[PDB]
Design an enzyme around this catalytic site. Sequence first.
Site, short mmCIF file in Angstrom:
data_model
loop_
_atom_site.label_atom_id
_atom_site.label_comp_id
_atom_site.label_asym_id
_atom_site.label_seq_id
_atom_site.Cartn_x
_atom_site.Cartn_y
_atom_site.Cartn_z
N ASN A 34 0.84 -1.30 0.02
CA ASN A 34 -0.06 0.04 -0.06
C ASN A 34 0.75 1.35 -0.07
OD1 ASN A 34 0.84 -0.49 2.91
ND2 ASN A 34 -0.51 1.21 3.23
N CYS B 108 1.44 3.24 2.61
CA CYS B 108 2.53 3.11 3.79
C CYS B 108 3.22 1.74 3.87
CB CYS B 108 1.45 3.25 4.98
SG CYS B 108 0.18 4.73 4.88
N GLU C 126 2.54 -1.44 4.39
CA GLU C 126 2.52 -2.20 5.49
C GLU C 126 1.06 -3.37 4.99
OE1 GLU C 126 0.41 0.38 6.07
OE2 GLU C 126 -1.18 -0.37 6.58
#
Lengths: 683, 683, 289, 289
Positions: free
Chosen positions: A375, A377, A379
């Site tokens: 994604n 981020c 994670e």
Amino acid sequence: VPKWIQLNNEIMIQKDGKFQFDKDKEAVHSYFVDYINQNTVFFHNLKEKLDYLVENQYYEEEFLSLYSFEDIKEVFKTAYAKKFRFPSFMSAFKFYNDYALKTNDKKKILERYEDRISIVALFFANGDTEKAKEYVNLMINQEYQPSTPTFLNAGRKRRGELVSCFLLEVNDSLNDISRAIDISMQLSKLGGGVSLNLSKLRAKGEAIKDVENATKGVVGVMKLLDNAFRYADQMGQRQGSGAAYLNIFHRDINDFLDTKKISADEDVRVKTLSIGVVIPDKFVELAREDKAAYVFYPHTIYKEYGQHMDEMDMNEMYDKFVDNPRVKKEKINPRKLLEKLAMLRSESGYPYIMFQDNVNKVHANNHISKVKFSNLCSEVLQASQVSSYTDYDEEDEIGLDISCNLGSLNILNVMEHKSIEKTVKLATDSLTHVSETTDIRNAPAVRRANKAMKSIGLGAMNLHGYLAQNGIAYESPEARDFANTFFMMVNFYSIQRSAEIAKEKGETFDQYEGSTYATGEYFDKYVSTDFSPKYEKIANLFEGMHIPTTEDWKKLKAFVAEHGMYHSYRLCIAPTGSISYVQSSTASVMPIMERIEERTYGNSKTYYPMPGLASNNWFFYKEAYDMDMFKVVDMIATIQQHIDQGISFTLFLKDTMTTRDLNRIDLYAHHRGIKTIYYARTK
Amino acid sequence: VPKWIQLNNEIMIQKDGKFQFDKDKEAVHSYFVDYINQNTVFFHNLKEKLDYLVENQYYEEEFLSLYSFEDIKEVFKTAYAKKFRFPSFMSAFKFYNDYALKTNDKKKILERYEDRISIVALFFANGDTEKAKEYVNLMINQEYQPSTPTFLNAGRKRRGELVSCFLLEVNDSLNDISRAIDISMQLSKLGGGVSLNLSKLRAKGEAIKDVENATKGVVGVMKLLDNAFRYADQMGQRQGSGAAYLNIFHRDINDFLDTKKISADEDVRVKTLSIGVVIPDKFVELAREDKAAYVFYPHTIYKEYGQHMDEMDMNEMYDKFVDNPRVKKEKINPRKLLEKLAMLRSESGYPYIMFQDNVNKVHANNHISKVKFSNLCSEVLQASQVSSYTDYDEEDEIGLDISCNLGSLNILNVMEHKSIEKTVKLATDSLTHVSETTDIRNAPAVRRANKAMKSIGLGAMNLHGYLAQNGIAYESPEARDFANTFFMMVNFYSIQRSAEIAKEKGETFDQYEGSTYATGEYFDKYVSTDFSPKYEKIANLFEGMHIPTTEDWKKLKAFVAEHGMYHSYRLCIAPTGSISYVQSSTASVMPIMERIEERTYGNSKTYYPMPGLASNNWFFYKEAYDMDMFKVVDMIATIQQHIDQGISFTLFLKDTMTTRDLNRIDLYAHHRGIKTIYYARTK
Amino acid sequence: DFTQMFYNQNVKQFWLPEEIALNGDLLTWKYLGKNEQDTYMKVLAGLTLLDTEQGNTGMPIVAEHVDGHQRKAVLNFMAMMENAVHAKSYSNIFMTLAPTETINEVFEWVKQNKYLQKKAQMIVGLYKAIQKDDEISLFKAMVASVYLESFLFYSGFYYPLYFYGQGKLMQSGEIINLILRDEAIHGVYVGLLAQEIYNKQTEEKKAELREFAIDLLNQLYENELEYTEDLYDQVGLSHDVKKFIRYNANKALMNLGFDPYFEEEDINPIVLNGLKATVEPLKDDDFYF
Amino acid sequence: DFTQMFYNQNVKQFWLPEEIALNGDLLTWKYLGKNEQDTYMKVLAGLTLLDTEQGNTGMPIVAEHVDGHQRKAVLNFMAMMENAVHAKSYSNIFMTLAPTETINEVFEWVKQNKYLQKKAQMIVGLYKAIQKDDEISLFKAMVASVYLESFLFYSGFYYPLYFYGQGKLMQSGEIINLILRDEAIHGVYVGLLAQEIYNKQTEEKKAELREFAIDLLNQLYENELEYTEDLYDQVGLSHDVKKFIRYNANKALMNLGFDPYFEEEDINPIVLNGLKATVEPLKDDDFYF
Ligand SMILES: Nc1ncnc2c1ncn2[C@@H]1O[C@H](COP(=O)(O)OP(=O)(O)OP(=O)(O)O)[C@@H](O)[C@H]1O
Ligand SMILES: Nc1ncnc2c1ncn2[C@@H]1O[C@H](COP(=O)(O)OP(=O)(O)OP(=O)(O)O)[C@@H](O)[C@H]1O
Ligand SMILES: Cc1cn([C@H]2C[C@H](O)[C@@H](COP(=O)(O)OP(=O)(O)OP(=O)(O)O)O2)c(=O)[nH]c1=O
Ligand SMILES: [Mg+2]
Ligand SMILES: [Mg+2]
Ligand SMILES: [Mn+2]
Ligand SMILES: [Mn+2]
Ligand SMILES: [Mn+2]
Ligand SMILES: [Mn+2]
């Protein structure tokens, strides 16, 4: 300058050679005596407040109508009975500036912390007053924190979606590219961060309808996506954030990376599009042996084999691709590519690094699909199936696009209450409710995967805060022992809650029978290795809480075999940007960047010490940049062995260390089983 | 340097003070006896050629399967019986470089001019050998020229689309904007120029669901469309060309124009998207009276009235918009806006100017919709209905997106053969066939409008060539008299052919009953005014041809009332850029830019004299820049009175004249009934 | 039509040697063979020596004879960049990579080198031949200047760009890229000043100036081929360097408003990776006819 | 012993007028009397002329005759500042404050003003009299340059400083202070070069050079008095400015190593108030742990 701001800036003023940390508490009082109470709208009773908020289109009628007014009043009373007080000025400031509901004119405060928590609890419970009170006790004890979308928007009519992490698969067609642009715009409109996999897209210089040197590559698609994300910027509130992931064996990988170079031209560089690189084990093996690697043209591989390059295992396919004359490829130096990645991360922190085999050797749903990208981020690591968006008046083949549900445990608050099991199960229930109540009508694959996979992300935060307030260094083996035990219990209770929900509802996630949960392989390391603390200090920390043993894990494995598992994915550790302030917690499982952080709001300066920072624990609150990144990698791998998805893992580097040190950290992360590397923040 | 190149350059080497025009002819001979005949691929007979072109995926076998090989042989023999010779080197060079079919590696020539004409005729006839021979005679005599898409791509397997221009209506929604971007990419992939009406999109600083100052305006959509056209660039062969049209009463009209300013920032500047401005008569009236005007926010008008700002008449609703407090507006100086338009056109030739009231005062299909914008060449002026592209899993309301097929009459060849009627009817039949066989599977509104409107564009070329080769000054009243008579004849025979097709097929275009063709209003000026030539020279030019009188027009009006019309739109005069070279014709009805044009190809330079240029007609071939633009406006208005769609009217300006002169030319064009102005090319 | 625009582009490209730290180049320099180090040193000295002529004579002499305050200012700025920025940058690169004794020897060698001297003295000869108030002699010198800025430097620039495109000697390669970017704009600007003179001439005089330019280009080109083999045969690159020379010769000609002389060729991909009308208000009665 | 430190100081002082936004002076300008605006425009126009010739002629010609690449680099940089930065900044000020016709008129006024023409004639004459390898003609031109840098500018500088010190026209004043900061170091540097030449002479020759310097100063001074009266009488400041130019004449003499010539006087206190990451390759041992 307001009085609370002076009281906050008085922290740096040293008395007897010590920071006046306690003054921060006084600031909070001022911030509530001078500002918050003055600008907070008060009503004669809660009935009038709820009527005003519902009538003025602040709240939703549906979730409040599921309860009688007596039950809602009881939930609000339970929230207010805690008499919760923000321990630091920045916690209250961040809540009342980012999350507290304000009037349309943005000058008055309609929601306190207890009001917002009660509303979120009532939304979570979906009509159960006792469950709502349990959620209120969970959030007012600050044991669990719903993500910024859920916490901010739950129960509000004027709101975005409760999910803000979206992963899209883009198929190699103009129709699919246009649909990906449209879906990215629609999801950014909803307020979500959108990640797109561009590995299936054919490289630059490929054939379109058997005309040569026609494709613009993934860089033109990145330009289109960057324009789409700039256009869709939450109605002009936040900058549109998007991520693009490319496999390192895609031929465009250099041009991809060239989009983040400062020297790149205006027609090459994308500014609002984050980039991530997926690195299979084959690339690391080629770089390790110094053998020259090959970056492949995806469309030639698709024509030769009928499958996309990122859809097959490169470890067993690389030699066949190289030896295949009908597969077009370009010679590269993998060590030079690694050095380029390290240099780019030093300059800008990009790209994100995804170790594909590290993700997929523990992935429970490889039968559905292997995790091809992450994604925004870095994670979320889930199986995704690409969609075939055909022409108009033609039925599309809808695949699976990842959209997981975020929520973070406060490790300090959870462990001091000795409530790992209850907090994990209640957070799982809330995440399941938010996933079930999410309905996106412009992202077909996202909606289909939300209905089928039922994937949620239960994260943790305040790890470094908890360790520092307990006299444990983040790099110490005791800290890793605690992380191992705590996250093994989190995984145990998350799996138990998922199996209990599957048993209650009588349904599992789609294609669960092929998962390692169904076959019992997932529990192998849990039925043979005991994850009880190896240090007496950590065991005393876990005192009063039952630590699941190998027999308990065997019982859980049998329970999952009999009843299944409701969620395809349960745990993912998100960065937890601003909710960590409101919870008075350190961000994610990352070590703290600064002991006291200086921020500028408006024309005023403010000072936020890390939670629980004092003279006694000043040394234990070691800054992340001063830490050995190998030990941070060790801790993150220790946590990752109990997390089914990834962990947002930011590297913290000094300006002195070179790209060789960055590459060494990346290779040690790959060796230690790190799934994703988020950022390379240089001090 | 090639021998033909030297012979062509020998034109400018003056002998006895005169240009060596005849040398040009020699060049063609060289170009054929040294390059074309050697680079052509010859077969034993036509059967082997057709088989090789069919199996090697050069030709579509379906259109050739409708004829027995004897019929195809007869058609090819009819094409070659004319012994057509290119009179200039550039004609043959342009055909064999841009339109003649070559091999996959482009090393040899597979199609001669006769072969291409035969294939296009066989495609046009759709199984009729006699009709195929008629088309062959029409094209080998160069009386009619199919547009570049049709001429280049007819009967080819690797072809694109035969439609040159597409016009899209963009509704004010994110779904509609994304669909417009997708359709623009799809149609640029097909090779057609795409025009988008952005007047319905709400301006910058409008509300997206009660959050104000949220919209990016038409400039963000402009940037998205610019990137989409950059990405979809005909597989990298021809740069993707798009047009954006905005009403002058849109609030973003300045920012719109600021996209073409040479000092514009990169976040605003748009470089691959042409801009056009739609000016109602209200704006010209306000500028004339020097009264300060008001630009409007489209979304406020839509909220108040339920209709878009460009969906209704500004001449009657402008005062209501201004006096309505619920409508948001900004004060502007209409004269300053006109001066900005003139300055922008002087600097870059943009925007296109569309006089909306001039278009709609004679528009025959105002009942379906008013013409709100034009195409990329600013000559297509048709009714369009916006589409409501809804969310996924929701049915879309498909409107009408303009699309017409182009074809040009060669005025010199048509009048030399005394075959206005036959050429017009055959061209109408060919354009009807092109419309019927056009099916676009990714533009639903374009497909529906093609099926319903059945609109075609029949243009004309070599107006200035015919006038100069007949000793008529382009600015003379005799030239305007000739244009009046010739284009009245063209309109008469186009209407007759449309009515005959409607009679033979038993069907008219959709909503024909509400058109001015059905009510007989369209024929008013044709049943009361005589358009026979007023000068004896023009009447002699029209000798041997029956010029329709008011009685013939009355009979045609009765015939249309009885049978209807098959085509909503029939005549549109496109620029006809490069296909005018092959026909040895001056571009469109515009006057020639230069008598001899020097063009650089490869490392060589070539000189193309205007067709028929010589010593006796040197001064009749007056350059456009040396001409009075007012008399060119008079000519274009005289032609426009007989053309139902617009004419691509390029203004030819000198560097000495000011923006005030450009504004005066624009206002005289508006006064004279000019519908659209294409370009402001400065010498 | 152009001087203020070039003024802007020039001043916004201002930079200083100190901005790029050079010491990290020693981490790749140590891994090059003797022939690679030798070629690099010789190329660098070649560029240094030619650029000094441009700073001391080429730019100041053109600034002296060109009329116009704004042109003199732009030309002064360019001369400043040669003497104050470029010359210090070349010295810095040398001092980082070689010890003092090695630098002195390389400069002794390149100073005696036949092919470097031939081109250096040909260019300087044309600068020395400019006569007061004679625009023909000024034009000839401008042609020489454009050939230096846009053509002669490139047999030298090739090598640093070749390393830069491979990830080697990145700090000095960044410096060279900034220098090259300045020389490109210098060549374009002086080219426009030459075209201004050329366009003031008769047709016969124009044909004569074209013959001068092509003849000069030919002499320099034939010497560049020899210069190239002399330096690059030992590292096996001469074929590709020759393509780069011709490509840049064509750019130099285009700067002087002339047609390309050489056929189009593709360039080494590693080196590639390294690389108003008068506003008049409406007066009313313009709306009536 | 000094060129390197002057090189570093000059390049670290680099600036462009566009760094200073000028629209803030619009109101304090509007508020000045017509006499004040007239004197201000003319004063800056006189400065523009001096910098035009210092940049076009003075600094480049001195650079040509001074030996040493580093000395030449400093002088070339100073030349660039004169015409590419200083002279241009005045146009930035003019274009902000004044309409085009007033700007056109003031530039016409410099051409016909007899004191400004005389001072240009005298200074530029000495620059153009420099003979190659003739150190005495060079010394004379360097004296002229010091007198331009450290004396002649000051009849002009007075007025922007006078306003700056009262809190008026402070953005224009900021530009002028930057120009003045540059000229101060330019005058010192050229002064040191002049002293080098002077110190090579016999005592008899030195005595003649002092005579030249003092005669030239007096001749320039007498002309500057008339110029000062012509500009400042209408604003009532001529006597004050005269004291300022005498003060600065002494500074010019001192820059040349000579004793002060005028007696000390109290200057208007208003005017006094007016004053990438390092890259290592990956070893095979970095892939194993
Ligand atoms: N640190 C804090 N965090 C949150 N709210 C606070 C804080 N300090 C004060 N407040 C708010 O201001 C009110 C006043 O609190 P105070 O410290 O004066 O005493 P109290 O006994 O808590 O008051 P009360 O009668 O309001 O309960 C609190 O009830 C609360 O609403
Ligand atoms: N201007 C031209 N346009 C088209 N084709 C040409 C032209 N000139 C030559 N050709 C082609 O090249 C051939 C060369 O023949 P050319 O015109 O010299 O006369 P030919 O051999 O007497 O025969 P013919 O004229 O009857 O074809 C022609 O037959 C024709 O196919
Ligand atoms: C989502 C979005 C819309 N817009 C603009 C462009 C569209 O023309 C316009 C309409 O968007 P819509 O898609 O119609 O948004 P909406 O339907 O949710 O809001 P409303 O009910 O008011 O129609 O908003 C932006 O400028 N930026 C954005 O990010
Ligand atoms: Mg496809
Ligand atoms: Mg809408
Ligand atoms: Mn240089
Ligand atoms: Mn240069
Ligand atoms: Mn100066
Ligand atoms: Mn100076």
